[PDB]
Amino acid sequence: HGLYLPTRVTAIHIDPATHRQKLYTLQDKAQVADVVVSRWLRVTVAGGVHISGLHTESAPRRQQEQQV
Amino acid sequence: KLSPDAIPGKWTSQDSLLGMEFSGRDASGKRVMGLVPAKGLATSVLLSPDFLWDVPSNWTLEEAASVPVVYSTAYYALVVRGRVRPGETLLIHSGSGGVGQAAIAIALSLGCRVFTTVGSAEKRAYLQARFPQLDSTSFANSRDTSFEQHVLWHTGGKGVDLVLNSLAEEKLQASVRCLATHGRFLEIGKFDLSQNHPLGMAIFLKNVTFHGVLLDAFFNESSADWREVWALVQAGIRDGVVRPLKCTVFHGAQVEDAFRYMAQGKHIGKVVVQVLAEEPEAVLKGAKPKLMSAISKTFCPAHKSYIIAGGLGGFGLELAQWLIQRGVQKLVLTSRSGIRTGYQAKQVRRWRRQGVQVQVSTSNISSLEGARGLIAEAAQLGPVGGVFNLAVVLRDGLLENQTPEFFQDVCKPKYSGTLNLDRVTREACPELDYFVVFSSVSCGRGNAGQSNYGFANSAMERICEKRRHEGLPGLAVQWGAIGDVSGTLPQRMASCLEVLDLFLNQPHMVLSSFVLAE
Amino acid sequence: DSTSFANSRDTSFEQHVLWHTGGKGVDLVLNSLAEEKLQASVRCLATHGRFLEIGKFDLSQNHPLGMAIFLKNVTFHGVLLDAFFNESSADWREVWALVQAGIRDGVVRPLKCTVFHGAQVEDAFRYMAQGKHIG
Ligand SMILES: NC(=O)C1=CN([C@@H]2O[C@H](COP(=O)(O)OP(=O)(O)OC[C@H]3O[C@@H](n4cnc5c(N)ncnc54)[C@H](OP(=O)(O)O)[C@@H]3O)[C@@H](O)[C@H]2O)C=CC1
Ligand SMILES: NC(=O)C1=CN([C@@H]2O[C@H](COP(=O)(O)OP(=O)(O)OC[C@H]3O[C@@H](n4cnc5c(N)ncnc54)[C@H](OP(=O)(O)O)[C@@H]3O)[C@@H](O)[C@H]2O)C=CC1
């Protein structure tokens, strides 16, 4: 719980050609890219982007508490 | 400087993560000193017997408050990981600190030669007093990287066998260079480990075992490996090696002063807090600790059952999540359609996996028979502890387009439902201790075009007032606009839940909460 | 078993081990590979793991090793057997006893052997240089 921000990424691979190949148009005009997260293998894949070894560290709240 | 979540073990308590060790009395009156993953600074603690030693007769409970953590970590670092053997030469950083003193005590017993790094001359003199075995050539400066040259000189350039490093950045690199062939490096700090700083692998050409020691793992897992350290600490206690540290005793009423004194960093030894004074008796077999005045905050038992009418709605799910955090383990959530969205399914599955006995229902509280059925289900789970009423049906419009049917529809979930719940709760809910119904600022201030909503809310307030008059629990909370789930800017869910925590404790009957635009 | 094999010339053993181990990892790792593959192996350690390094290339070149792995109780070992020939004979007797006990208990089996005559030492060196030998 709480807001977590990226701190380190072990490796990111991007391949625009395969990315264009992967995209498939929805019934609406919008284009969508399927995504899969494998928390065991620490890999996130969507289209032509492949993120591995993402590390997120807890961030203290700004506690602006503008609402009193 | 440290996020609470960094502590191992999914606590989620959001509070009470400020303690690690204590020395008090067992449930039988036995003098015990213990070790707890968290929630140490408290008048009581719930600890398994595998983390509880017995205070010997010489020791006083004040002294015993220092041994557990420091000697456990020292033993686990040296004996169980570094496999220290007699005659070696080991370097222990920050000798004055508790772990340094424990490690020095352990090493000298075996016969090692010890290099220690202190911060000032007073600490050097104190350590000279404590351990006469240490010569003038067994000290260095801990605030700079000059200990490297000192150790490399007095060791003949061969280095040291063990390094109980606790420093960070450049100083850590200096410690690595002090290692000897077949050396063993024990890292008990958590800064360079966290930041993922590089470590040149060339050091491993020399046989080196670079350890990473985190005692906090045992508290939540690896129960099998723990008994080794417990046996080692008990052996040290009975043999005389484990000696209590120096203490600076503060009282419970001045805990902030103790925290500031630690923050100044001028403490030599250990800082302790006296929650309750020790009696002269060996075994008092007392009943309770002395009562104190503490800010009030809501909690719930485990055998009680709790009912949320319209719990599958926006505010209902967040209130249910909040209640679970306070010990609720049998819930009833009422909706006319049951689960029909993804978010509801996710939340209910998560709570069931956590162990809670959630149970959705379709017992429309509007009808008295439905209310009786709902209370019966809650009882089947267990005695009804509390009842919350978050149902609402909205048929807005100026009075011109209003009809009696709209009024009936809007008031059935709220006016009639509250009445039926009150009657049934009086009839067959003797252990109930919460009765909360949610109203809107429209009831008080009046928001144009919500007349039926106002009438429904206004009725719910009168029932709550009457209940509280007859000695029964009752509370109508008047909310404004809830944001995440008039001239009143919306409100974050966290702030709403904090205010609700405040409200449930007040002696009053109807309370309100909103945020003013500009 | 058939599920216990992977590929040694690629960084894919990381995924195989993590998947078949349930995402936990492997308690003890004996590594003799290069830089990228050494990093791949390190990411396979589980909590309270142990890393036994027998290679030399990364050690000799002083490649950087992230110290974040030690947040877990991972222990990193640099294993060189040559230290015994120069000193620590009293420690070497322990390994000697281990090997003798293994031999007498049948655990120690000889490897498959390829024989070259003394006059053909050059051919033996060439054959091992190729890298097709097993045993
Ligand atoms: N493996 C694990 O997970 C465990 C970790 N530890 C670590 O062991 C170390 C010893 O902890 P502990 O016994 O509480 O030590 P203390 O907090 O009592 O003292 C630490 C030492 O750091 C130096 N220091 C300088 N300024 C300060 C300051 N403001 N506050 C504290 N220390 C200061 C001093 O040594 P000097 O005279 O050289 O300036 C001091 O004696 C810590 O780094 C702790 O995190 C402890 C147990 C378990
Ligand atoms: N959040 C806000 O802005 C404010 C709301 N309030 C009150 O606080 C509570 C907050 O919940 P809210 O966010 O409005 O919830 P919703 O907007 O989700 O609607 C009410 C919830 O109760 C259920 N419900 C409604 N009528 C009945 C009924 N007759 N029997 C059983 N279940 C019923 C609904 O599910 P289903 O439709 O399937 O029955 C729904 O889950 C409500 O009681 C509301 O009146 C007042 C002030 C501010």
> For C105-135, what is the HEC assignment?
HCCCCCCCCCCCCHHHHHHHHHHHHHCCCCC
Burial label for B382, CB within 10 Å (0-12, 13-18, 19+), is: middle
Residue B291 pairs in a beta bridge with: none
B187 inside 8 A of chain C by CB: yes
Q: Do A40 and C43 make contact, defined as CB atoms within 8 angstroms?
A: no
Tokens of C112: 């498959």
Dihedral of the alpha carbons of C39, C44, C50, C53, in degrees to the nearest 10 = -30
B358: CB partners within 8 A, 6+ apart? B331, B333, B348, B351, B352
CB–CB of C71/B8 below 8 Å? no
Alpha-carbon span B308 to B295, nearest angstrom: 27
Residue type for position C135 = G
Secondary structure class of B262 (helix, strand, coil): helix
Alpha-carbon span B458 to B463, nearest angstrom: 9
Alpha-carbon span B233 to B53, nearest angstrom: 9
Residue A13's φ and ψ, nearest 5 degrees, are: -120, 135
Residue B27's φ and ψ, nearest 5 degrees, are: -60, -20
Residue type for position A54 = L
Alpha-carbon span A8 to B196, nearest angstrom: 9
Report the sign of the C-alpha dihedral through residues B79, B81, B85, B88, in that order.
Answer: negative
Q: Obtained via which technique? A: cryo-EM
CB–CB of C33/C41 below 8 Å? yes
Pairing, β C45-53 against β B179-187: unpaired
Residue B431 pairs in a beta bridge with: none
Dihedral of the alpha carbons of B181, B182, B187, B188, in degrees to the nearest 10 = -120
Report the sign of the C-alpha dihedral through residues B257, B258, B259, B263, in that order.
Answer: positive
Residue B35 pairs in a beta bridge with: B21
Burial label for B151, CB within 10 Å (0-12, 13-18, 19+), is: buried
B372: CB partners within 8 A, 6+ apart? B424
Q: Do C73 and B213 make contact, defined as CB atoms within 8 angstroms?
A: yes
Alpha-carbon span C106 to C102, nearest angstrom: 6
Residue A36 pairs in a beta bridge with: A45
Tokens of B288: 């309770």
CB–CB of B242/B73 below 8 Å? no
Cα three-residue angle B166-B167-B171, rounded to 5 degrees: 140
B442 lines ligand 1 (CB under 6 A): no
Extended strands (E) in B252-311: 270-274, 305-309
Residue B160 CA from chain centroid, whole number: 40
CA atoms within 13 A on the CB side of B465: 8
Secondary structure class of B97 (helix, strand, coil): coil
CB–CB of C6/C33 below 8 Å? no
Over the Cα atoms of chain C, what is R_g? 18
Angle of the B451-469 helix axis to the B404-411 helix axis, nearest 10: 40
Pairing, β B515-516 against β B488-489: antiparallel
Alpha-carbon span B358 to A20, nearest angstrom: 46
Candidates C13, C15, C24: best to mutate against A (most CBs of A within 10 A) is C15
Candidates C76, C81, C84, C85: best to mutate against B (most CBs of B within 10 A) is C76
Nearest CA to ligand 1 atom 19: B97
Pairing, β A49-58 against β B179-187: unpaired
Cα three-residue angle B264-B258-B326, rounded to 5 degrees: 120
Extended strands (E) in B166-263: 179-187, 198-200, 208-212, 247-251
Nearest CA to ligand 2 atom 42: B390
Angle of the C35-42 helix axis to the C13-20 helix axis, nearest 10: 10
Dihedral of the alpha carbons of B325, B330, B332, B333, in degrees to the nearest 10 = 30
Tokens of B66: 């220092």
Residue B433's φ and ψ, nearest 5 degrees, are: -135, 5
Alpha-carbon span B363 to B369, nearest angstrom: 9
Using CA atoms, how far residue B37 sits from B19, B20, B188, B273, in Å, is 8, 6, 17, 18
A53 inside 8 A of chain C by CB: yes
Tokens of B465: 């007032």
Helices (H), B4-47: none
CB–CB of B360/B335 below 8 Å? yes
Alpha-carbon span C71 to B212, nearest angstrom: 7
Quick one: which of B434, B175, B218 has its CA closest to B326? B434
CB–CB of B51/B34 below 8 Å? yes
The resolution of the experimental structure, rounded to one decimal in Å, is 3.5
Tokens of C71: 């947040």
Quick one: which of B354, B364, B303 has its CA closest to B334? B364
Tokens of C32: 């003799």
Q: Do A41 and C15 make contact, defined as CB atoms within 8 angstroms?
A: yes
Q: How many CB atoms lie within 10 A of CB B372?
A: 17
Residue B210 pairs in a beta bridge with: B185, C76
Alpha-carbon span C99 to C57, nearest angstrom: 28
Task: Find tokens 């209310």 and name the residue.
Answer: B371
Alpha-carbon span A52 to A38, nearest angstrom: 10
Tell how far the Cα of B390 is from the centroid of ligand 2, in angstroms: 5
B37 lines ligand 1 (CB under 6 A): no
Q: How many CB atoms lie within 10 A of CB C81?
A: 10
Tokens of B336: 């006319």
Quick one: which of B400, B339, B209, B497 has its CA closest to A67? B497
Helix %, strand %, coil % of chain C (to 5): 45, 15, 35
C43 inside 8 A of chain A by CB: yes
Candidates A10, A13, A39, A41: best to mutate against C (most CBs of C within 10 A) is A41
CB–CB of B307/B378 below 8 Å? yes
Using CA atoms, how far residue B393 sits from B96, B171, B444, in Å, is 67, 66, 19
How far is it between the farthest Cα atoms of chain C?
A: 55
Alpha-carbon span B14 to B17, nearest angstrom: 8
Quick one: which of B434, B445, B436, B432 has its CA closest to B418? B436
Tokens of B334: 């009422």
Burial label for B395, CB within 10 Å (0-12, 13-18, 19+), is: middle
| B105 labeled binding residue | yes
CB–CB of B45/B39 below 8 Å? yes
CB–CB of B102/B184 below 8 Å? no
- Among the partner-chain residues C48, C67, C75, the one whose CB lies closest to the CB of B199 is C67
CA atoms within 13 A on the CB side of C1: 2
Alpha-carbon span B351 to B487, nearest angstrom: 37
Alpha-carbon span B92 to B167, nearest angstrom: 11
Alpha-carbon span B375 to B383, nearest angstrom: 9
Q: How many residues does chain A have?
A: 68
Alpha-carbon span B100 to C28, nearest angstrom: 31
How far is it between the farthest Cα atoms of chain B?
A: 99
Q: Do B214 and C64 make contact, defined as CB atoms within 8 angstroms?
A: no
CB–CB of B315/B438 below 8 Å? yes
Secondary structure class of B114 (helix, strand, coil): strand
Residue B374 pairs in a beta bridge with: none
Pairing, β B21-25 against β B31-35: antiparallel
Tell how far the Cα of B506 is from the centroid of ligand 1, in angstroms: 43
CB–CB of B138/B114 below 8 Å? yes
Helices (H), chain A: 16-22
Quick one: which of B50, B86, B82 has its CA closest to B68? B50
DSSP letter at B221? S
Q: How many CB atoms lie within 10 A of CB C37?
A: 19
B451 inside 8 A of chain A by CB: no
Quick one: which of B162, B204, B459, B460 has its CA closest to B309? B460
Alpha-carbon span B186 to B74, nearest angstrom: 10
Nearest CA to CA, how far is B149 from chain C (Å)? Answer: 23
CB–CB of B132/B139 below 8 Å? no
Nearest CA to CA, how far is A5 from chain C (Å)? Answer: 17
Alpha-carbon span B239 to B112, nearest angstrom: 18
Interface of C with A in 5-34 (CB under 8 A): 14-15, 18-19, 22-23
What atom of ligand 2 comes closest to residue B310's alpha carbon?
22
Report the sign of the C-alpha dihedral through residues B460, B463, B468, B471, in that order.
Answer: negative
B53: part of which helix (H) or strand (E)? strand B52-54
Q: How many CB atoms lie within 10 A of CB B28?
A: 8
Secondary structure class of C24 (helix, strand, coil): coil
